[PDB]
Design a protein around this nucleic acid. Structure first.
Ligand SMILES: Nc1ncnc2c1ncn2[C@@H]1O[C@H](COP(=O)(O)OP(=O)(O)O)[C@@H](O)[C@H]1O
Ligand SMILES: [Mg+2]
Ligand SMILES: [Mg+2]
Ligand SMILES: [Mg+2]
Lengths: 1541, 16
RNA sequence: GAGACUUGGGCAAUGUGACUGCUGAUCAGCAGUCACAUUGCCCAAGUCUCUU
RNA sequence: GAGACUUGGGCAAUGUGACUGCUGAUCAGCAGUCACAUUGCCCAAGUCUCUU
């Protein structure tokens, strides 16, 4: 700070003597004793930085008050180089640990704090006492009796009596109290307390120059008459006041705890009854003392404080009494002002009239005060005025201030110069008069006085000690001096020169006053006489003095680790420990004390304790010990009480309840009450409640295997069985045009290909199939045709036909495949059927007996064609051909026959005036010598498509394929012919797309049967059912009363349960990646919404003794995707999900064909070779035809090849390469991510809720062991699930309701739901700030469930009423409709803001300004001028109130009716353009990107500035608001308006 | 009593 | 009345602890959804090869 | 009917940004209710030694 810190003429020898032994300094205030304390710290600053465990030390600075603690903290920070710890209670100290304390000790070389904080620090032995080099004691004159200074000083004896810290005593006045006679008897008490000699400066005369900084002011006194005359109105009001006292004694407030006198004498009225008595007593005291005009302001103070107490009252009984008291104080004010106005008829000069009425109605004492002030100041300069005025009581200060403002305003000579102020002690009275409690004035009155803003200071005894103030020029002690120390220090507050000390005394009591002042003068002169007359000797060897001084009280207790309990500290710790018990409705959390009667003393301890009092301690009804403990015989009631408390503490600790710190023990966890019964199935998967994964996409993508459907396993027919054949119908939808002639006619042909099964198949609905010409509808025969394998060779021929079909006619084959007859996974056969006897179709054995080996296309020479017979025209009609001269082996379909055309053909568009013979000689004449059969026959042919996955909807477009296409004609003898009919070929192309829907349709049928069996639906429409065909999910982007909701209409009725269509389940199976016309994503949103509603309701019903915070933080993990994944894995469903895109050419394994069995064995049973063999090794297994179509396994050469494939992978750069991505389909494994699986879980939920209603859906949710059943009763409906308690219902009867519901029918006139129980309504309208929350609760638990209710109702309504909207807009629409702001607009439009009950400062006017904004804006939904804060409470009020409406009838239809009546305009305005978030809208711009600055705290508001390149200009705009999230929206609001250019 | 009794304006700040 | 001491109401000042309420900032979790940079699939317009 | 090829359009699987609806923890500021503890003070009553 400065180098002028050189010590005064005394402090050097002061600290020199302090070094030798303990000392106490007595120097007057303002003489820098804090500085000499810092000097002592400097002298004892040798061993500070070293740690205690290494022998280091620190220091301790003791304090008295938190304000003085801060003052000394600043004083030590300004001129020290060490580190100081500012330790104050009600924060940190009660929550710190030994590690934190030790670490602070390591850094802090010295500490400061109040006395009890250090007491708890040392007695609990955070650090050893010897760790402190010195102890600094302020206000050491308090170090007597049971004050904490003496208690701490007691610890020195019991501690290690070697290398003790030094103690220094500082006090402006050495003695506190009136036992000033024989002050030598008082000094030695404090001397032996610290066992150090008192020291005072010897050269007082020479250092009186420095003492001029604390100059003695002149002492004058003012004498006023004290005539006993009182007015009539005082007697008029006194009788009524005592009448009110009686009436209050007759009040009927609720029960109140035990309250009686200090020595446990007769009972005393409860605090809420006696506080008003005390207040009125003090008001009457002020009125009698200071005058009527004083009471004229005191009564306003009573009004303004009773209003606060009424506002802060919780029970309704208190409010009526406080309102009666307020009306009484209003009457008192009225009559006081009536007296004022009955006076003041003399003059019309309002200023002079006010001054003269103040002079008149003032009591003579206050009149003398006023005119003494007037003559002392006399319109001098404001800077010349700086003083303290001390009165006795706090309300005295307030009333004196209130009258002084009016007196000063009534005098122009003092108007511009006096600025009064007042402050008081701990009982913090409001510093305002005309306003309710809304003030926030951080700068306390001491700082205001230090700034010079105020010049005259009114204060109680709060300012007499400790607080450092400017050296004021005057001191006026309005109230009589009563104590020696206070007089000494008050005369010390006129610290400057030429100061004046004014005392106001009564005329008739002036003689005793001067006598008392003279006695005080003699005492103050005699205080130094003991030290001046003291015999020069040390203060050390008399340890017996200290021993006797501290052994008088009750002996303490100690144990291991040095923890010591102070017997004088037992009451606090007992009350704290007994306050941790779970209280009843009115259970008492305090011990009950009952002094034993006179002759019970011998009943327990004997006749030896007749005069020694004994008291029993009664534990609470929920204590660890329900018994009682009795006190030791002690000579007084208070010592008996403390002894009983100490013994109770000792027994409680010896029973192990209290820890070594003696602090009450705590609680560990609460959420784990349910985290064991709901999340127990994770452990078998390696997961737990507290385990989470956030790296490497672990627990996000998992490899799964698939199982064939239950109706395809072991389906391969054998000899001597009734085989079943289901034919396939392909119905053409596209019209018959020139382009669609073949695809129509040859697809309507009777010939079909069918499936032979050993099992049964259900009725599978028609599904669409999109091909190039258009869409095809496929249905399977309902009734199979029973056939029997009557020979092994017939089965062999059928199986060879199946294999060669898949090998050639579709080319869906791989070299390493083997014709399968052993494995039963998805194994079956496909066989054509033809008319053999009547309409029924038998086996077309002609085909299978011919096409064992498909006709191999080969070139024919002229000699061969010369020997080749002439083909008939019928030999090609409907057959399949291909050209052998060309390198192309592609099959070619015969379209039109030529019986009327010759090879020297006619003209064409391209080869005009040319024949086909000339064209073929010109083009391919190289490999044709001549056409030997050059007559009477060519063929008109058309090629056929190669695409197989006929799933995409738009691939079959024809708008641009409508253009002209060439007509192609070929010569027969140059094109090789197949006897196969293209009729069957065209249908056989579509096969894999049929099979990969049959697969998942059978899976969906199995799941449908399971979920109709578990929910016991086996009714009529579920056995003789007919399944509606496949629907199209158009929204997959691939091209007044209410209408009752269809989602819930199937809950109270059974006729409306629509049968669960198999198409819905198939949609629930197929993921997005499969890319079919239908998907699960639309049902996803509804399923998730129902899951949320059900989980919230279930948790809020089972745990009605929990808060919504724990409910949310548990239902988070219950509904989390991690939970759904493991749940559905437990359900073992993933074997029946459709994800992959159906790549048939590479991954779709043929049904009756698989790679060799030995390969399966030694590659699937071996973990070491699990995924080491890559597809490059697999493709090299080009086995023999007999090695792959009959034998069924690999040869030795192929054996070595595929056993060395993995080794070659391990000796090349292929080592470590992934061989699982779409190259592990051989074993049937599939890799699926978690999102898909969870989405299918609640997609099944959505299907079930849509078709079967809410009730059946919630019943099914039980099956997934997520909603655990209750032991008392397994589970009930989603409705009538009885929930409620002390947080969902008001805890008051019907009589108290109207006192909290001023208006109810006016809310009814708009809501429309007559409540049969208003408790829900009251609990919904009760804000947390409202005082009843401590006993009744808040609307939080209700908003939590109303949120889910409104969410699900809105989600269901938008789902059902809009059939072709993707979730991209569905969630946007519901979020816009559940956004908080539009909820506030709904609240204000329907005028629910009137009834909402809350009490907070900013909330008082935020609602009013928002409703004014809406009314001016015409109820315009923002979904905005001057960034007005939205009152987020109103939306939460609706959220809780919807739930309150629901619970009153437990029906959802009524809630939906009310919600629709509420939202009718909104659901017709939002559906048009679905307004989105404005920040989102701004970020949606292509190039006008935003960038937002940092938060700015430049004032009470916050703001952020943004930049956007509008018209490629680097513009900058800014927005203001209360919070960052408010300005950011408004900043965007301005910016988007700027884009209006 | 109808009204208080007024006090004399002049006095002395007598030393104590 | 002095001294010793007690009781009851009252005054001023000091401090601990419990409880909930409001606001602002920071950190992280849950469910739904959207915009910008990577592969695959299907089209618009146009060029070449191949097929009459 | 296919391939090659360009420009553009549309849809689905990775990395950033941001919105909605529940919330939690920490820090800070402000405010309420209640209990208890210590020093000193006057007022009224009472007991004893004691002066009268
Ligand atoms: N030797 C000194 N060096 C520097 N400042 C001093 C010295 N002596 C007194 N002061 C100043 O005088 C003021 C005295 O006030 P205070 O410290 O409250 O007195 P005390 O400590 O005696 O109560 C302090 O603000 C202090 O800064
Ligand atoms: Mg000071
Ligand atoms: Mg999902
Ligand atoms: Mg809310």
């Amino acid at each position: 700070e400065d180098v002028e810190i050189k010590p005064r003429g005394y402090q050097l020898r002061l600290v020199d003597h302090l070094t030798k032994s303990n000392g106490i300094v007595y120097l007057p205030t303002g003489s820098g004793k804090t500085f000499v304390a810092i000097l002592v710290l400097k002298r004892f600053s040798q061993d500070f930085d070293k740690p205690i465990e290494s022998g280091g030390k620190r220091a301790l600075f003791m304090c008295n008050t938190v304000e003085l603690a801060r003052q000394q903290a600043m004083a030590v920070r300004r001129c020290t180089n060490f580190k100081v710890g500012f330790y104050v209670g009600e924060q940190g100290v009660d929550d710190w640990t030994r590690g934190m304390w030790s670490d602070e000790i390591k850094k802090n070389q010295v500490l400061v704090g109040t006395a009890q904080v250090f007491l708890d620090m040392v007695t609990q032995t955070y650090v050893a006492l010897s760790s402190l080099s010195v102890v600094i004691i302020d206000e050491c004159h308090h170090g007597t009796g049971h004050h904490p200074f003496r208690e701490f000083m007691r610890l020195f004896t019991i501690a290690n009596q070697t290398k003790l810290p030094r103690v220094v005593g500082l006090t402006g006045v050495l003695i506190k109290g009136n036992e000033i006679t024989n002050v030598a008897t008082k000094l030695k008490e404090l001397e032996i307390t610290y066992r150090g000699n008192i020291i005072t400066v010897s050269d007082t005369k020479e250092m009186e120059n420095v003492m001029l900084y604390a100059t003695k002011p002149t002492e004058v006194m003012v004498s006023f008459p004290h005539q006993e005359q009182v007015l009539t109105v005082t007697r008029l009001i006194s009788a009524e006041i005592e009448k009110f006292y009686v009436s209050l004694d007759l009040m009927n407030i609720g029960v109140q705890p035990i309250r009686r006198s200090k020595s446990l004498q007769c009972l005393r009225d409860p605090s809420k009854k006696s506080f008003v008595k005390q207040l009125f007593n003090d008001f009457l005291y002020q009125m009698k003392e200071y005058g009527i005009y004083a009471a004229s302001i005191a009564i306003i103070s009573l009004i303004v404080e009773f209003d606060i107490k009424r506002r802060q009252a919780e029970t309704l009984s208190v409010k009526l009494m406080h309102r009666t008291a307020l009306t009484l104080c209003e009457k008192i004010r009225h009559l006081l002002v009536q007296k004022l106005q009955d006076m003041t008829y003399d003059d019309d000069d309002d200023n002079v009239n006010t001054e003269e009425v103040i002079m008149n109605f003032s009591t003579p004492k206050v009149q003398r005060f006023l005119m003494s002030l007037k003559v002392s100041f006399a319109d001098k300069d404001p800077k010349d005025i700086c003083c303290l005025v001390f009165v006795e009581r706090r309300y005295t200060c307030k009333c004196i201030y209130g009258l002084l403002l009016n007196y000063i305003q009534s005098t122009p000579e003092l108007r511009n110069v006096l600025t009064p102020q007042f402050m008081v002690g701990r009982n913090n009275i409001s510093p305002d008069f005309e306003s309710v409690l809304e003030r926030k004035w951080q700068k306390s009155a001491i700082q205001q006085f230090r700034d010079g803003n105020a010049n005259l200071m009114i204060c109680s005894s709060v300012l007499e000690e400790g607080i450092d103030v400017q050296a004021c020029n005057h001191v006026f002690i309005l109230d009589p001096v009563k104590t020696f120390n206070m007089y000494v220090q008050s005369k010390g507050r006129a610290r400057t020169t030429e100061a004046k000390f004014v005392l106001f005394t009564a005329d008739k009591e002036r003689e005793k006053t001067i006598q008392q002042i003279y006695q005080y003068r003699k005492a103050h002169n005699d205080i130094a006489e003991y030290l001046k007359d003291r015999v020069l000797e040390k203060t050390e060897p008399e340890l017996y003095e200290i021993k006797g001084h501290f052994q008088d009280d009750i002996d303490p207790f100690t144990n291991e680790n040095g923890a010591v309990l102070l017997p004088n500290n037992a009451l606090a710790i007992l009350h704290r420990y007994c306050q941790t018990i779970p209280t009843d409705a009115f259970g008492f959390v305090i011990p009950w004390f009952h002094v034993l009667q006179e002759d019970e003393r011998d009943r327990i301890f004997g006749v030896s304790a007749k005069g020694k009092h004994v008291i029993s301690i009664n534990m609470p009804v929920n204590c660890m010990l329900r018994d009682t403990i009795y006190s030791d015989p002690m000579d007084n009631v208070k010592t008996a009480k403390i002894s009983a408390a100490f013994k109770a503490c000792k027994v409680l600790y010896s029973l192990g309840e209290l820890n070594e710190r003696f602090v009450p023990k705590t609680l560990k966890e609460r959420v784990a009450s349910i985290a064991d019964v709901h999340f127990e199935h994770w452990n078998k998967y390696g997961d737990s409640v507290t385990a989470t994964v956030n790296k490497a996409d672990k627990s996000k993508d998992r490899t799964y295997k698939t199982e064939c459907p239950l109706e395809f396993y072991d389906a391969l027919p054998r000899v001597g069985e009734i085989c079943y054949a289901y034919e396939i119908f392909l119905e053409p939808q596209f019209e018959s045009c020139e382009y669609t002639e073949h695809m129509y006619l040859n697809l309507q042909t009777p010939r079909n290909y069918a499936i032979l099964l050993r099992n049964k198949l259900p009725r599978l609905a028609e599904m669409p199939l999109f091909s190039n010409q258009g869409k095809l509808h496929v249905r399977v025969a309902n009734a199979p045709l029973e056939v029997i394998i009557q020979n092994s060779e017939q089965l062999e021929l059928l199986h060879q036909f199946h294999g060669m079909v898949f090998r050639d006619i579709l080319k869906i084959w791989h070299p390493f495949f083997v014709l399968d007859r052993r494995s039963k996974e998805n194994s079956y056969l496909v066989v054509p059927l033809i008319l053999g006897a009547g309409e029924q179709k038998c086996f077309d054995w002609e085909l299978m007996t011919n096409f064992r080996r498909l006709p191999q296309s080969h070139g024919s020479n002229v000699q061969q064609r010369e020997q080749q017979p002439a083909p008939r025209p019928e030999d090609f009609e409907g057959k399949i051909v291909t050209q052998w001269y060309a390198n192309y082996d592609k099959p070619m379909l015969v379209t039109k026959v030529h019986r009327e055309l010759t090879p020297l053909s006619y003209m064409e568009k391209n080869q005009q005036d040319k024949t086909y013979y000339e064209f073929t000689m010109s083009k391919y004449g190289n490999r044709i010598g001549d056409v030997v059969h050059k007559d009477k026959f060519m063929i008109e042919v058309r090629d056929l498509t190669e695409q197989l996955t006929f799933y995409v909807h738009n691939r079959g477009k024809f708008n641009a394929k409508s253009k002209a296409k060439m007509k192609v004609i070929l010569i027969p003898e140059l094109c090789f012919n197949f006897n196969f009919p293209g009729d069957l070929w065209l249908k056989l192309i579509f096969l894999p797309s049929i099979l990969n829907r049959m697969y998942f349709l059978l899976h969906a049928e199995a799941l449908r049967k399971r979920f109709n069996t578990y929910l016991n639906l086996h009714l009529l429409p579920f056995n003789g059912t007919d399944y509606m065909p496949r629907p199209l999910e158009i929204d997959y982007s691939l091209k007044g009363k209410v209408k009752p909701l269809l989602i819930l209409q199937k809950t109270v009725s059974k006729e409306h349960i629509t049968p669960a269509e198999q198409g819905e389940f198939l949609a629930a199976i197929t993921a997005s990646s499969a890319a079919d016309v239908f998907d699960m994503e639309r049902l996803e949103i509804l399923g998730n919404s129902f899951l949320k509603l059900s989980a919230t309701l279930y948790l809020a019903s089972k745990y009605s003794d929990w808060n919504e915070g724990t409910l949310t933080e548990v239902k988070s993990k219950l509904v989390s995707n991690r939970n759904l994944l493991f749940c559905l894995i437990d359900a073992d469903i993933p074997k029946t999900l459709n994800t992959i895109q159906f790549t048939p050419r590479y991954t779709w394994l043929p049904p009756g064909i698989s790679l060799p069995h030995n390969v399966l064995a030694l590659w699937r049973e071996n973990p070491e070779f699990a995924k080491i063999i890559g597809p490059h090794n697999l493709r090299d297994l080009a086995l023999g035809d007999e090695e792959s179509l009959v034998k069924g396994n690999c040869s030795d050469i192929n054996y070595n090849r595929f056993v060395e494939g993995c080794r070659a992978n391990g000796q090349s750069f292929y080592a470590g390469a992934d061989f699982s991505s779409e190259v592990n389909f051989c074993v049937g494994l599939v890799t699926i991510p978690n999102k898909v699986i969870a989405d299918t879980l609640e997609a099944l939920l959505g299907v079930i809720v849509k078709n079967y209603g809410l009730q059946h859906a919630f019943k099914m949710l039980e099956y997934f062991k997520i909603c655990r059943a209750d032991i008392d009763k397994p589970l009930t409906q989603l409705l009538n699930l009885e929930l409620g308690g002390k947080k969902m219902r008001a805890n008051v009867n019907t009589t108290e309701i109207d006192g909290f519901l001023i208006n109810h029918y006016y809310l009814e006139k708009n809501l429309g739901y007559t409540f049969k129980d208003r408790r829900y309504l009251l609990q919904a309208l009760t804000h947390p700030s409202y005082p009843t929350n401590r006993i009744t609760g808040s609307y939080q638990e209700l908003e939590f469930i109303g949120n889910a209710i409104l969410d699900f109702l809105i989600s269901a309504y938008i789902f059902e009423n809009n059939t072709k909207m993707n979730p991209g807009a569905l969630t946007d629409l519901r979020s816009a409709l559940v956004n908080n702001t539009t909820l506030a607009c709904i609240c204000v439009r329907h005028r629910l803001h009137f009834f909402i009950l809350a009490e907070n400062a900013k909330l008082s006017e935020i609602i009013s300004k928002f409703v004014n904004f809406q009314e001016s804006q015409g109820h315009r939904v923002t979904n905005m001028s001057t960034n007005v804060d939205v009152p987020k409470a109103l939306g939460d009020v609706l959220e809780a109130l919807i739930a309150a409406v629901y619970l009153d009838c437990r029906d959802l239809q009524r809630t939906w009716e009310v919600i629709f009546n509420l939202f009718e305009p909104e659901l017709q305005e939002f559906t048009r353009k679905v307004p989105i978030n404005h920040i989102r809208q701004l970020v949606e711009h292509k190039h006008a990107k935003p960038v937002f600055s940092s938060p700015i705290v430049e004032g009470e508001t916050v703001m952020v500035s943004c930049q956007f390149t509008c018209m490629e200009k680097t513009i900058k705009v800014y927005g203001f608001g209360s919070n960052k999230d408010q300005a950011k929206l408004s900043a965007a609001k301005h910016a988007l308006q700027q884009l209006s250019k | 009593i109808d009204r208080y009794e007024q006090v004399s304006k002049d006095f002395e700040f007598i030393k104590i």
